[PDB]
Amino acid sequence: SKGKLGEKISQFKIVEELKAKGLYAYFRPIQSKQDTEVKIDGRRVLMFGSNSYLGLTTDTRIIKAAQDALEKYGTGCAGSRFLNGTLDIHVELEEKLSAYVGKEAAILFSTGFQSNLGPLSCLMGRNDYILLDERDHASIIDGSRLSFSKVIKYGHNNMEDLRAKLSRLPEDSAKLICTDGIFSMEGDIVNLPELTSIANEFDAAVMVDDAHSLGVIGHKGAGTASHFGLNDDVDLIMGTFSKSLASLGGFVAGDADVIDFLKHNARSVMFSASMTPASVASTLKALEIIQNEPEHIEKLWKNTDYAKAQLLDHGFDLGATESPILPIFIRSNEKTFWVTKMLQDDGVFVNPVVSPAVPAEESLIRFSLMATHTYDQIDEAIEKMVKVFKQAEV
Amino acid sequence: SKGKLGEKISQFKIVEELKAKGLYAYFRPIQSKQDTEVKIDGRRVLMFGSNSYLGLTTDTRIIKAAQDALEKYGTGCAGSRFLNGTLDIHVELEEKLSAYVGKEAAILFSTGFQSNLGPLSCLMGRNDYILLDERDHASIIDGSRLSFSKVIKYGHNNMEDLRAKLSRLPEDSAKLICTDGIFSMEGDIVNLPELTSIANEFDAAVMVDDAHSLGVIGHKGAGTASHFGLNDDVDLIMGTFSKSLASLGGFVAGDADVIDFLKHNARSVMFSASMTPASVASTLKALEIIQNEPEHIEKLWKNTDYAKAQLLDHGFDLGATESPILPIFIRSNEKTFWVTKMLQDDGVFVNPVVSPAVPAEESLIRFSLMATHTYDQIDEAIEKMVKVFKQAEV
Ligand SMILES: Cc1ncc(COP(=O)(O)O)c(CNCC(=O)O)c1O
Ligand SMILES: Cc1ncc(COP(=O)(O)O)c(CNCC(=O)O)c1O
């Protein structure tokens, strides 16, 4: 029955307003492979809003690996890993990931999102605590909420606030600190040396979400612990396959005893169907390519350094990025929607960040680099961005 | 740091005990396509533990559709649907699903699990209520927990307990009833006529999870509302693609206003990467096949009716199934593990249900049919099951 349900959704009008003004640019329907240019409505659009940092979703070797896995294994495993959903190739991928991030063991999940839900929901319980950076990804907030623990947020990269909040807590309790490695909004890196120093003082577990770090920072792209040399101070390394690894799915890597507990206690792996064979194969081949072909990471950072310098030289106001995420401040929600749509209509795809995700005065567009971008494409996007920021009067 | 974390996992010894006794049969590594026979450790094993009800994960047309989508679109969309992750083929699949279940609109999620999280987390809020059948799937319990509402469980298919629990609630609040259509444990069907009758009396929204119903009950497999003719009394139809549809992903279908609210407010679609092209294409082709080839559903039910009659004639104690899930009671956790492993070692794959999921005296094996099974295979499995139940002294 719909009476109260209709009332619950009645006040949500921002989408009707964006559509009526001709500003709507969510769920833009792409007609082609994710690449430096995509086809939208039959026309070519430069893609600066992707998470495919190494451009690997179009690698013919990766497509072929996925197609060969369909031929051998079919379209799906039709069950949880726990029951009838495990393939030899899932186990192979766990072994290869464990080696890549320097841990004993790993467990796959069918999404990155579900990779966060698993350990956050089942390790800390009643009378225990989870400490979260306030900018942590939605999946981390949701995972922690599924736990029976007390969830405490600390100020963004604020080690005094983390330390104080941990100091308040009863000694006879378990504590788990979970952080993004690279934060997607501003593209900044966690203070992992200080956070792990605090964790070691209070015997808290440390979990890092490396969604935006894998294939980006660390030796051969192995992520945030690898970047800082702090593998031995991080209990759990979470990753997704949907970004540099060009696929779908995720993982959690750690000590074999903790991983064995997770694979038999995390509801998001016990009660969800396993990754498709095509996605296991594509992830395995992308992981081989990231490690054996240092070019990709190198070219990603040449593009990042080039685009960042060009944006600062044109007078754009950038956030405190340390990654291929270039946050360009606009500081008005209306201007952010307008700039986004005008760029779309001129052949440039960027992602807006607006209220209520952020305060109006912190609204921005995120311009993300891909190893496969050219300096010519970067130049064309920035040319168009200068013109639209002028038209918009930013 | 690991001191307290080590203590949190210290008491979990059932897996070490199962492995040490040689009884462990979780995460069995399959070497072949999901089919009526699978390869485990180089040997052939009859599969009676699958959710591929129509045997479609090996359909050459479905494999080819997936392989052609890899060729055109690549290995992944590398973002949320909300941003850079929408393809024309995702929209096509939503339109085809909406038509199939008789609703205005639909939104895809990358997993079934995440399809439950979406509407349960964002429609009911502070001062509202979610009413759940106590046997509802883990993803429904987890979705409801992510809401800011009060979650109330009612007795399994107990309409007096649902009615009483709703009667206690303040009139000026929203209420949402969520149920499995077919329940996976016992394979029983929700009392949807009575539940919708109650919902209509209290103006509560109705959501049905049709994970085990799609491709199984309803006209051309359209699910539980379709089975009862109650499309107009169900607000939201949830489905997965991982079972009859032989893929990965899921959906929620409903009124265009509710679906528009979900696609801009459900964290599990806004903040998770979209389905892979291969999985969209495989789902589209499976959905065409289920509707255009009535054979598949027909043969599933011939196998179900045959196997159920054969089990009852051999004196097995079955649960109150109304589906291709045949629950065979064992009523001892030890016997359930032993029967499971002995069947594995004799070439038969079944799924155990044990404590703490159920009371010891309700422990069972689930024997699930596939349209592609033969009567010869059914006969061979039941022959082996009689022998193992004798060896085990059930
Ligand atoms: C009733 C029900 N609802 C939702 C889901 C989630 O769908 P996905 O597996 O596609 O994420 C399942 C999964 N069934 C697998 C299990 O519980 O083992 C299910 O049985
Ligand atoms: C930091 C972080 N962690 C986890 C995930 C979840 O991974 P999957 O998308 O593979 O489920 C994302 C997703 N980023 C997409 C977004 O927020 O739009 C992420 O940005």
Side-chain angles (χ1 to χ4, degrees):
Chain A
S1 194
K2 198 182 184 184
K4 292 302 190 170
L5 176 59
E7 294 168 23
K8 285 304 308 186
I9 69 163
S10 68
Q11 297 306 97
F12 183 70
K13 287 319 196 220
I14 183 66
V15 174
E16 277 324 309
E17 289 187 351
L18 285 171
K19 291 175 175 177
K21 294 182 162 163
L23 295 174
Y24 187 75
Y26 292 109
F27 300 90
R28 281 179 272 192
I30 291 172
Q31 295 172 298
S32 65
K33 46 211 187 184
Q34 189 85 183
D35 204 348
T36 60
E37 284 207 320
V38 294
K39 195 169 78 151
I40 306 176
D41 300 329
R43 75 196 77 160
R44 299 265 278 265
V45 179
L46 291 169
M47 171 56 63
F48 284 102
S50 185
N51 304 292
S52 188
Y53 292 116
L54 301 183
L56 288 182
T57 61
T58 62
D59 188 303
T60 58
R61 296 171 288 184
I62 304 175
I63 289 170
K64 182 56 184 170
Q67 288 171 327
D68 291 341
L70 275 157
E71 194 78 23
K72 170 164 179 185
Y73 293 107
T75 57
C77 302
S80 73
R81 288 290 304 280
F82 187 77
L83 297 182
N84 62 298
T86 296
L87 297 171
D88 54 358
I89 54 174
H90 295 114
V91 172
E92 183 184 344
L93 179 56
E94 292 165 338
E95 288 174 346
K96 287 179 160 33
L97 288 161
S98 291
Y100 182 57
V101 304
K103 290 300 184 187
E104 283 173 6
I107 178 54
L108 313 178
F109 300 79
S110 46
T111 65
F113 191 107
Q114 288 171 205
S115 304
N116 281 324
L117 306 180
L120 295 163
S121 68
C122 73
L123 287 173
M124 300 299 99
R126 279 174 167 267
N127 299 315
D128 300 323
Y129 302 92
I130 300 172
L131 276 289
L132 300 183
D133 190 290
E134 70 188 335
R135 287 201 196 166
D136 274 352
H137 190 258
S139 55
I140 294 170
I141 284 52
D142 291 3
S144 298
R145 187 163 179 83
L146 289 172
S147 80
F148 296 104
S149 80
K150 174 64 175 163
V151 181
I152 298 169
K153 292 175 135 161
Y154 62 87
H156 182 55
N157 245 344
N158 183 344
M159 308 286 92
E160 296 83 17
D161 192 44
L162 175 57
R163 176 180 271 283
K165 274 169 165 155
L166 281 172
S167 302
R168 275 17 274 334
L169 297 185
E171 177 281 339
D172 180 45
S173 62
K175 295 102 175 169
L176 190 148
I177 305 163
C178 183
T179 189
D180 290 32
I182 289 167
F183 289 86
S184 66
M185 201 246 282
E186 257 195 292
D188 48 329
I189 302 166
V190 60
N191 193 347
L192 197 60
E194 210 33 50
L195 179 152
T196 61
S197 291
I198 291 167
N200 287 341
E201 288 210 12
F202 292 93
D203 185 34
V206 173
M207 165 171 176
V208 182
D209 169 348
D210 267 2
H212 291 280
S213 303
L214 269 201
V216 183
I217 62 167
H219 181 59
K220 302 175 173 293
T224 310
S226 173
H227 175 77
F228 290 110
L230 297 180
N231 172 280
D232 294 315
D233 297 293
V234 175
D235 295 276
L236 291 166
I237 300 168
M238 170 274 184
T240 186
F241 306 145
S242 58
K243 300 184 183 288
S244 301
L245 287 161
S247 311
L248 190 76
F251 70 106
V252 177
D255 291 353
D257 54 356
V258 181
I259 297 304
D260 204 58
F261 182 86
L262 280 193
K263 77 190 282 196
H264 302 91
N265 285 267
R267 292 155 62 90
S268 64
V269 76
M270 287 193 297
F271 303 125
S272 197
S274 60
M275 286 175 61
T276 64
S279 292
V280 177
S282 76
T283 302
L284 279 162
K285 180 63 74 176
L287 176 65
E288 288 179 18
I289 291 159
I290 295 181
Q291 292 178 83
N292 294 345
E293 297 183 346
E295 312 80 88
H296 301 292
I297 297 172
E298 180 178 46
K299 199 172 181 299
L300 170 65
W301 279 100
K302 280 195 238 263
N303 285 333
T304 298
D305 289 347
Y306 180 70
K308 187 184 183 182
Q310 285 302 315
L311 289 169
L312 288 173
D313 288 352
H314 280 82
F316 292 95
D317 177 0
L318 301 197
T321 180
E322 307 167 67
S323 78
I325 303 159
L326 307 193
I328 305 162
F329 284 116
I330 294 179
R331 317 210 102 105
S332 152
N333 292 320
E334 203 184 46
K335 292 206 167 157
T336 299
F337 298 124
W338 191 94
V339 164
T340 302
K341 179 63 166 143
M342 291 290 288
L343 278 173
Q344 167 60 31
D345 290 348
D346 210 15
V348 179
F349 194 114
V350 294
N351 292 316
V353 173
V354 293
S355 307
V358 293
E361 47 273 1
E362 296 203 79
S363 69
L364 61 77
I365 55 164
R366 288 170 68 259
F367 179 103
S368 289
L369 285 309
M370 303 169 56
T372 42
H373 280 124
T374 72
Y375 300 161
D376 281 351
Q377 283 171 329
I378 291 166
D379 288 344
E380 175 183 340
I382 294 178
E383 192 162 339
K384 283 189 197 231
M385 285 197 301
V386 166
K387 184 214 308 170
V388 162
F389 277 54
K390 178 147 56 80
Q391 290 172 140
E393 309 159 5
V394 187
Chain B
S1 194
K2 198 182 184 184
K4 292 302 190 170
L5 176 59
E7 294 168 23
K8 285 304 308 186
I9 69 163
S10 68
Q11 297 306 97
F12 183 70
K13 287 319 196 220
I14 183 66
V15 174
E16 277 324 309
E17 289 187 351
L18 285 171
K19 291 175 175 177
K21 294 182 162 163
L23 295 174
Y24 187 75
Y26 292 109
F27 300 90
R28 281 179 272 192
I30 291 172
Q31 295 172 298
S32 65
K33 46 211 187 184
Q34 189 85 183
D35 204 348
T36 60
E37 284 207 320
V38 294
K39 195 169 78 151
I40 306 176
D41 300 329
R43 75 196 77 160
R44 299 265 278 265
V45 179
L46 291 169
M47 171 56 63
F48 284 102
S50 185
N51 304 292
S52 188
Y53 292 116
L54 301 183
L56 288 182
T57 61
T58 62
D59 188 303
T60 58
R61 296 171 288 184
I62 304 175
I63 289 170
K64 182 56 184 170
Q67 288 171 327
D68 291 341
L70 275 157
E71 194 78 23
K72 170 164 179 185
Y73 293 107
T75 57
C77 302
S80 73
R81 288 290 304 280
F82 187 77
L83 297 182
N84 62 298
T86 296
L87 297 171
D88 54 358
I89 54 174
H90 295 114
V91 172
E92 183 184 344
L93 179 56
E94 292 165 338
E95 288 174 346
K96 287 179 160 33
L97 288 161
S98 291
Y100 182 57
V101 304
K103 290 300 184 187
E104 283 173 6
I107 178 54
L108 313 178
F109 300 79
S110 46
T111 65
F113 191 107
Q114 288 171 205
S115 304
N116 281 324
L117 306 180
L120 295 163
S121 68
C122 73
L123 287 173
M124 300 299 99
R126 279 174 167 267
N127 299 315
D128 300 323
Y129 302 92
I130 300 172
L131 276 289
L132 300 183
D133 190 290
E134 70 188 335
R135 287 201 196 166
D136 274 352
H137 190 258
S139 55
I140 294 170
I141 284 52
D142 291 3
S144 298
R145 187 163 179 83
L146 289 172
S147 80
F148 296 104
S149 80
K150 174 64 175 163
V151 181
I152 298 169
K153 292 175 135 161
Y154 62 87
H156 182 55
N157 245 344
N158 183 344
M159 308 286 92
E160 296 83 17
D161 192 44
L162 175 57
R163 176 180 271 283
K165 274 169 165 155
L166 281 172
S167 302
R168 275 17 274 334
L169 297 185
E171 177 281 339
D172 180 45
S173 62
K175 295 102 175 169
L176 190 148
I177 305 163
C178 183
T179 189
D180 290 32
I182 289 167
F183 289 86
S184 66
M185 201 246 282
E186 257 195 292
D188 48 329
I189 302 166
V190 60
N191 193 347
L192 197 60
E194 210 33 50
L195 179 152
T196 61
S197 291
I198 291 167
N200 287 341
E201 288 210 12
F202 292 93
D203 185 34
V206 173
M207 165 171 176
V208 182
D209 169 348
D210 267 2
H212 291 280
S213 303
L214 269 201
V216 183
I217 62 167
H219 181 59
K220 302 175 173 293
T224 310
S226 173
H227 175 77
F228 290 110
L230 297 180
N231 172 280
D232 294 315
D233 297 293
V234 175
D235 295 276
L236 291 166
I237 300 168
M238 170 274 184
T240 186
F241 306 145
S242 58
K243 300 184 183 288
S244 301
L245 287 161
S247 311
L248 190 76
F251 70 106
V252 177
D255 291 353
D257 54 356
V258 181
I259 297 304
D260 204 58
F261 182 86
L262 280 193
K263 77 190 282 196
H264 302 91
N265 285 267
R267 292 155 62 90
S268 64
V269 76
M270 287 193 297
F271 303 125
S272 197
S274 60
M275 286 175 61
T276 64
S279 292
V280 177
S282 76
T283 302
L284 279 162
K285 180 63 74 176
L287 176 65
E288 288 179 18
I289 291 159
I290 295 181
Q291 292 178 83
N292 294 345
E293 297 183 346
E295 312 80 88
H296 301 292
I297 297 172
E298 180 178 46
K299 199 172 181 299
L300 170 65
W301 279 100
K302 280 195 238 263
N303 285 333
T304 298
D305 289 347
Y306 180 70
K308 187 184 183 182
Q310 285 302 315
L311 289 169
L312 288 173
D313 288 352
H314 280 82
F316 292 95
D317 177 0
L318 301 197
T321 180
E322 307 167 67
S323 78
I325 303 159
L326 307 193
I328 305 162
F329 284 116
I330 294 179
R331 317 210 102 105
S332 152
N333 292 320
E334 203 184 46
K335 292 206 167 157
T336 299
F337 298 124
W338 191 94
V339 164
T340 302
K341 179 63 166 143
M342 291 290 288
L343 278 173
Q344 167 60 31
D345 290 348
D346 210 15
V348 179
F349 194 114
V350 294
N351 292 316
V353 173
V354 293
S355 307
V358 293
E361 47 273 1
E362 296 203 79
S363 69
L364 61 77
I365 55 164
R366 288 170 68 259
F367 179 103
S368 289
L369 285 309
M370 303 169 56
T372 42
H373 280 124
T374 72
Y375 300 161
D376 281 351
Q377 283 171 329
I378 291 166
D379 288 344
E380 175 183 340
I382 294 178
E383 192 162 339
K384 283 189 197 231
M385 285 197 301
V386 166
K387 184 214 308 170
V388 162
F389 277 54
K390 178 147 56 80
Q391 290 172 140
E393 309 159 5
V394 187

